[PDB]
Design a binder for these strands. Structure first.
Ligand SMILES: *Cc1cccc2[nH]c(C(*)=O)c(C)c12
Ligand SMILES: [Mg+2]
Ligand SMILES: [Zn+2]
Lengths: 37, 136, 175, 12, 171, 144
RNA sequence: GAUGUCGGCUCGUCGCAUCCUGGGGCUGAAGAAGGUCCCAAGGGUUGGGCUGUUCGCCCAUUAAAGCGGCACGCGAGCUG
RNA sequence: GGAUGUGUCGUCGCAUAGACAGCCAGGAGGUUGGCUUAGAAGCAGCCACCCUUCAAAGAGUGCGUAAUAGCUCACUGGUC
């Protein structure tokens, strides 16, 4: 998991979700699993 | 960058731009939206940032040269007068002011030479295209 | 440009999307104030080479030509425009932009071609027939071919205002 | 493995 | 948006209040929803219309139907997922109903089906989680798929048969 | 060596033996013999020696294998025709030379087994596309 | 018309930008041993040589031998 | 700085003669395009980005290997 403040896509899979008050990043690739929090 | 010669010093103040056209020397142009002071090296960071992205062309214009000398803290004290004769040189940009404006490279190949040169500038900016026909 | 009102007070428009202009020539210099979006979506095309319909509220279609327009800084939007009414046989002087066509003989060669001067101005356009453009050859140009007004072909009559040997374009070398 | 043109390679 | 509603014979809906009670051959079920979320059986088939349309309202809509459709496929044919034991020595027996795990752990893993679910083990390296409620079957099945998630190098543990899991490859 | 079958495709020279660089570990670790190939292959390449004729191999099992000769490269024949033994970094800037359309007759008369083009005109303007980006110009043509 | 200054010793206590324990994502994570980031301050966090020292180096260990704050915590508590 | 969190205004846009997302299926031949290297075949880097057929399929998305390969895409048809 990569916690960054600047979250953004990385390829053609990144599905920037928004669960419990949080902006995340789900991609087929896991190196792309981003998360602001 | 740093000017070849002048007086030596200054002071400060601000009010919306004045000599910031728009289209000129290119179809595309990156603009300043905030009242700042642009350090000389902060142009380098930009220009170079840009070069890299443009393998060739040199169609990049930087009409925002450093015409202002600032000083600095000589380690401490205060019991003296003018200090830091040589801290750094700035180029006082103001909203609507135009710093850069590429030419020749497609939209997206310009819409990046700017995004990038932007990240290292003290202010926010927006890119502009055409319909700038005041004087020429 | 169904521009209606025309007073010195723009309160009834500053707020509501409407631009603010003023046309003239030497006769009627009627104070104006046209619509935003309109002129917006309008001046774009024709640009400073297109006289359009000016039926001020009441019905009085007048012929004019976009002169000097002063838009707000900080914000790409305009604020004031200057319409210079058409004439008949002679308006004054116009601004004709420069273009180019066909692949240049310096582009694939090793460099790019550059228009030293975007919009170009000539002497005596000709009411009813004033170029809204200007296409100029470029191919022939190689590695240092400087095209000047002394070259660009003129639309039968139109005479050049700017100096003859002034470079309009030049294929700039690489790097 | 190991090259395209001198002499070794790959293969499982 | 969603509308089609295949409510075959066997079932039986009772939108009596916010309590959208159900009854079928597998077993009478019960699924609650929102009230302002209009829905009733028109003629033969069924439909869950909605008051307002956009988001706040169109979401619950996308909810209600789906969920009712499950209550349908529910009592009508019931649910049952298929799991597969994979890797050396991985296996699962049975104790009455209790799925008996045994997959590399110093000590086996015993699992217990919830009141409304039953396990099934064809071969000792394949799992079967049959049940009523669509959620549960899933809600329960997942727990097993947890006991031992597939390792990113040989894809061991529990998985979904045609489980597409690529191996990272090490040395 | 081991019990493995499947597919294979490569591009070895024509009139040149097959040492370690060409095959060896390349297509040898798939259960096959280089020896019996150093012959059979270079046997059909004699009619068209002095090039590198692409050829695909098909494996089955044990020590079985096949091969299908193709058409040798045509960049060699032109280089000799231009007195140049090396390519060009800039195919638009610094070009190679110039030929005649007669040289294209023998292109679509030997490379016909691969050319699935329409009829003549089709494959005739197909080959030019390969010539146009290499560094060779087209002589003559329509009109005039 | 006085708010005693360094270091140590005694006594704590709190913050976290966690030294070790505990939970987790990614790893260039094969196992083992590590890297990194995220969560987490319950509790722990050795004894010596040199130097007033603070630090730091060095001995020998260790799960670790955390970084700071409370008038660089603490002299109506001592040393000095 | 980041973001399918809403409200309101503006721009393209592309479209029942049936798109978008879903699905099945296809996927071109030249050519491992020419170039540089111990080599590099739609995907390290220079140059271009043409031909053929077609309802089609671009010397080309990204992942992948020492190049292969393999896996999908842009273009195409039916199902709604
Ligand atoms: C020459 C060389 C360079 C890089 C890798 C290589 N693999 C082999 C195998 O034989 C050789 C000789 C090389
Ligand atoms: Mg600021
Ligand atoms: Zn990604």
């Amino acid at each position: 998991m990569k916690v960054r403040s600047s979250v953004k896509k990385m390829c053609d899979n990144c599905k920037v979700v928004r669960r419990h008050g949080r902006v995340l990043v789900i991609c087929s690739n896991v190196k792309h699993k981003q998360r602001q929090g | 960058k740093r000017t070849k010669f002048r007086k030596q010093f200054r002071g400060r103040m601000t009010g919306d731009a004045k000599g910031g056209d728009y289209v000129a020397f290119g179809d595309y142009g990156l603009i300043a939206m905030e009242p700042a002071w642009i350090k000389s090296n902060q142009i380098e960071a930009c220009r170079i940032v840009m070069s890299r992205h443009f393998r060739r062309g040199g169609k990049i214009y930087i009409r925002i040269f450093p015409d202002k000398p600032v000083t600095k803290k000589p380690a401490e004290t205060r019991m003296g007068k003018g200090k830091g004769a040589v801290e750094y040189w700035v180029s006082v940009v103001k909203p609507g002011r135009v710093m850069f404006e590429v030419a020749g490279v497609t939209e997206e190949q310009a819409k990046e030479a700017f995004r990038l040169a932007g990240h290292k500038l003290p202010i926010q900016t927006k890119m502009v295209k055409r319909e700038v026909y005041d004087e020429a | 440009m169904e521009l209606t009102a025309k007073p010195r007070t723009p309160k009834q428009k500053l707020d509501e999307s409407m631009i603010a202009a003023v046309a003239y020539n030497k006769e009627n210099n009627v104070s104006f104030a046209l619509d935003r979006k309109a002129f917006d979506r309008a001046f774009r095309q024709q640009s400073t080479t297109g006289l359009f319909d000016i039926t001020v509220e009441g019905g009085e279609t007048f012929p004019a030509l976009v002169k000097a327009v002063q838009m707000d800084k900080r914000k790409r939007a305009p604020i004031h425009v200057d319409f210079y009414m058409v004439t008949y046989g002679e308006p004054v002087e116009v601004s004709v932009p420069v273009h180019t066509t066909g692949r240049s003989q310096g582009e694939v060669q090793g460099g790019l071609v550059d228009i030293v001067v975007h919009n170009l101005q000539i002497v005596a356009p000709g009411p009813r027939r004033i170029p809204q453009e200007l296409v100029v050859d470029v191919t022939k140009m190689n590695i240092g071919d400087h095209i000047t007004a002394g070259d660009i072909k003129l639309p039968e009559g139109c005479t050049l205002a700017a100096d003859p040997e002034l470079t309009v374009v030049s294929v700039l070398p690489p790097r | 493995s190991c090259t395209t043109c001198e002499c070794c390679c790959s293969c499982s | 948006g969603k509308q089609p509603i295949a409510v075959p014979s066997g079932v039986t809906v009772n939108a009596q209040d916010g309590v959208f009670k159900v009854k079928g051959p597998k077993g009478e079920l019960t699924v609650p929803y929102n009230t302002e979320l209009t829905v009733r059986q028109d003629g033969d088939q069924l439909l869950v219309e909605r008051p307002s349309d956009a988001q706040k309202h169109r979401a619950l809509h996308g909810l209600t139907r789906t969920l009712v459709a499950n209550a349908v496929k529910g009592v009508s044919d019931g649910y049952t997922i298929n799991l597969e034991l994979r890797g050396v020595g991985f296996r699962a027996k049975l104790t009455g109903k209790a799925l008996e795990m045994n997959i590399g752990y110093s000590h086996p893993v015993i699992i217990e089906p919830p009141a409304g679910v039953t396990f099934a083990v064809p071969e000792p390296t394949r799992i079967d989680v049959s049940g009523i409620d669509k959620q549960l079957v899933g809600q329960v099945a997942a727990n097993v798929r947890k006991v031992r998630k597939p390792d990113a190098y040989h894809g061991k543990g529990v998985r979904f048969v045609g489980e597409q899991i690529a191996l990272k490859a090490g040395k | 060596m081991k019990k493995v079958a499947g597919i294979v495709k490569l591009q070895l020279p024509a009139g040149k033996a097959t040492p370690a660089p060409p095959v060896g570990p390349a297509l040898g670790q798939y259960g096959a013999n280089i020896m019996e190939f150093t012959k059979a292959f270079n046997a059909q390449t004699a009619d068209k020696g002095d090039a590198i004729i692409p050829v695909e191999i098909t494996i089955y099992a044990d020590r079985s294998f096949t091969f299908i000769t193709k058409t040798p490269p045509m960049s060699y024949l032109i280089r000799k025709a231009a007195g140049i033994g090396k390519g060009s970094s800039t195919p638009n800037k610094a070009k190679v030379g110039k030929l005649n359309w007669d040289q294209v007759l023998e292109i679509a008369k030997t490379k016909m087994p691969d050319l699935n083009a329409g009829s003549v005109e089709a494959a005739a303007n197909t080959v030019a596309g390969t010539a146009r980006s290499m560094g060779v110009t087209v002589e003559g043509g329509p009109n005039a």
